[PDB]
Design a protein around this nucleic acid. Structure first.
Lengths: 121, 43, 96, 162
RNA sequence: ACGACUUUUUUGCCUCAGGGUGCUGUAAACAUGAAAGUAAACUUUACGAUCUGUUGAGGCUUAUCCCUAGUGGUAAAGUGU
RNA sequence: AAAUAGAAAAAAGUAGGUAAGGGAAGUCGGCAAAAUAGAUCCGUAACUUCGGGAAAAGGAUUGGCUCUGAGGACAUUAUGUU
RNA sequence: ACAUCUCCCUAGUGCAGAUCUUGGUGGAAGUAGCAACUAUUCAAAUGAGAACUUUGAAGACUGAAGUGGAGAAGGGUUUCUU
RNA sequence: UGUAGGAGACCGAUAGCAAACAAGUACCGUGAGGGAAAGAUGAAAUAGUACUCAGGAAUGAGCAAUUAAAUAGUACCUGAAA
């Protein structure tokens, strides 16, 4: 039974049990291992491996995000959110006020308007 | 639970010590054995 | 001993059975047909053939498989069932 | 034959209401405390089909003959037809020999032997006396939805093919 | 349901395959094809959902479909009287 | 891996589906089931303690593709980089 | 270890029954049943013997409010190797 | 009542102290508490089932073998009824 070896192997590899590969050949030599030092030796030789991962690709997402950048899927049937949930009311207000207040200060400070005109605007 | 004090610790080790079967060297000149899930200590 | 190359319609053999048991049943039917044809106690089903059957998951096994049946006596009688890769199934013959 | 069937299927009783605890197709209530036995006249679960039956007074509309090359053809439609449909009968194919074209339904399955008998007494009815004049006999496919009638017609209709 | 029943076991039968009948609806592939526009030359070259052509195409059609003595098959050798 | 497996596939059960034409006429009872439902754009009554009623009612639209328009940040005095 | 009918004292002294008490045991019956939680297959190893041990190859599921990590109560050597 | 004696026209293992015994124990109850089932080989096991064969291993059998006796084989006396 490879139980013992697989528990040690997971610690040696620093990887999940489900990703440990024991070679089906020389399995007796592998099974004979009974120390972490032995398990390290097996991995070093190449008789116990960590598997390549299943790891998903961003590719499909990159295409879709490019399409969203092109504005394509922003139509009505691809909305479930409220207009507020799509883009928040506070954020839009905050953007307009901050850009306008920055603009007003820069005009006054640079002397392209006066303090009186600034305060009214 | 994980936390305990000295009297509990000593007693549990005592109960563990006690549980072990009768020695066969005595026998050639009975047993009460506890199984943990079936019979609890009741401390 | 002999090696013969045949076509099994699995769609016909899997016709009555549910999605969940379809691929298991298809495997059993392969084993049963090979066993019956070569008339052996022992039937051995290759991993490549197995992978081919299970390839489209439980719902949709291959509808037709070309299998290679080998009668082999070394008692030590058995048959080994293996897939031979083929494109069209049209015009296939059941010879050695 | 249909196997052993419940009371609804076998005998046609009305289903119990939607409410019913042990099922809509649960049986008729046998009743009677006295007499202290089930009344045999109650409908009950058991075989459906595979029963012996006499259909009576079925009219012969035509007797076909194997020898006739135009056997299922008519004077109205003179194209070559034998009784065998387009692609043959489902589960029966080619009708090999001479044949009886009989009005309406006949008990049992296709492939079954059927016994024809003369009526117990001669029949003096209008329908008995009457001389059939057929205008047409279909030979369209019953394997499909019978959209076409003969192999020649199918060839003429489509024309070019691979 | 299972028994039971219908069968057949080499002028057959099974097995696939071919052909028939159908059912679906025009495959992949390729086009020095078109196409709402796009960008890059001073009408050409890049990109483009899509549509058309090759193409009533491609697929699927016996399991309880049809035909074919077309392919390859066709064993146990057990039991009661 | 669940206190089992296999083979068969009818009744019957149980968790489900689906139904022509009718549309609650069944039944104590529309119970069950289904219809309805998200957004954007419209439109919204009786009545009211004028705050509500209200998502009333009642409507329309919604995919894919190729565009068009609107919303910043930096630095050259109208021009750029982003 | 056993009797006493020769006589007589003495008694917790005679069971079919109490839905008796206690203990054993049948018929019911190889029957009811082993029905929550998507699915397992192929080949190998082990061993006297493998659907449900182990390994590999496939197919899948849990799907970060996880059959994942950590912890409390509570359990108490259940851990771990042979 | 505790301890020590001597007793009996008492009970004889479902009786008799709850207890003839590794019993006020096991076990059960949050806890106060509740509270069992449970004796017998033979004269002698310093007579305890040797050895062989067939058995993967359990075990079985023996022309083999202890004992006066093994259908006395240690959950061992006799061994009723269902």
């Amino acid at each position: 039974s490879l139980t013992l070896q697989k528990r040690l192997a997971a610690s040696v590899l620093k990887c999940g049990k489900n990703k440990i590969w024991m070679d089906p050949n020389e399995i007796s030599e592998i099974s004979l291992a009974n120390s972490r030092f032995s398990i390290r030796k097996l991995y070093k030789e190449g008789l116990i491996l960590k598997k390549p991962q299943k790891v998903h690709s961003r590719a499909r997402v990159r295409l879709y995000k490019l399409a969203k950048r092109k504005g394509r899927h922003m139509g009505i049937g691809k909305r479930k959110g409220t207009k507020n949930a799509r883009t928040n009311q506070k954020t839009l207000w905050i953007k307009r006020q901050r850009v306008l207040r920055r603009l007003l200060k820069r005009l006054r400070d640079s002397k392209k308007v006066d303090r009186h005109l600034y305060h009214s605007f | 639970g994980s936390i305990k004090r000295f009297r509990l610790k000593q007693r549990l080790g005592k109960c563990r010590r006690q549980n072990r079967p009768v020695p066969h060297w005595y026998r050639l000149k009975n047993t009460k054995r506890r199984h943990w899930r079936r019979t609890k200590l009741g401390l | 001993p002999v090696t013969k190359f045949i076509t099994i319609n699995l769609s016909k053999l899997t016709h009555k059975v549910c999605y969940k048991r379809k691929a298991p049943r298809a495997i059993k039917e392969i084993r049963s047909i090979a066993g019956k044809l070569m008339h052996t106690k022992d039937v051995r089903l290759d991993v490549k053939l197995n992978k081919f059957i299970w390839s489209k998951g439980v719902r949709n096994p291959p509808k037709r498989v070309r299998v290679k049946l080998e009668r082999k006596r070394n008692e030590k009688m058995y048959t080994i069932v293996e897939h031979v890769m083929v494109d069209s199934y049209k015009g296939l013959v059941n010879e050695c | 034959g249909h196997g052993t069937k419940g009371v609804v299927s076998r005998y046609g009783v009305k289903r119990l209401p939607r409410k019913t605890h042990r099922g809509l197709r649960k049986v008729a209530c046998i009743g009677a405390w006295h007499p202290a036995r089930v009344q045999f006249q109650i409908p009950r679960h058991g075989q459906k089909g595979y029963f012996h039956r006499t259909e009576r007074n079925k009219k012969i509309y035509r007797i076909g003959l194997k020898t006739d090359k135009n056997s299922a053809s008519t004077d109205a439609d003179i194209t070559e037809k034998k009784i065998t449909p387009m692609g043959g009968f489902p589960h029966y194919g080619v009708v090999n020999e001479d044949f009886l074209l009989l009005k309406g339904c006949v008990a049992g399955t296709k492939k079954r032997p059927i016994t024809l008998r003369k009526n117990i007494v001669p029949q003096v009815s209008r329908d008995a006396l009457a001389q059939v004049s057929l205008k047409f006999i279909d030979t369209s496919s019953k394997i499909g939805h019978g959209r076409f009638q003969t192999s020649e017609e199918k060839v003429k209709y489509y024309g070019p093919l691979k």
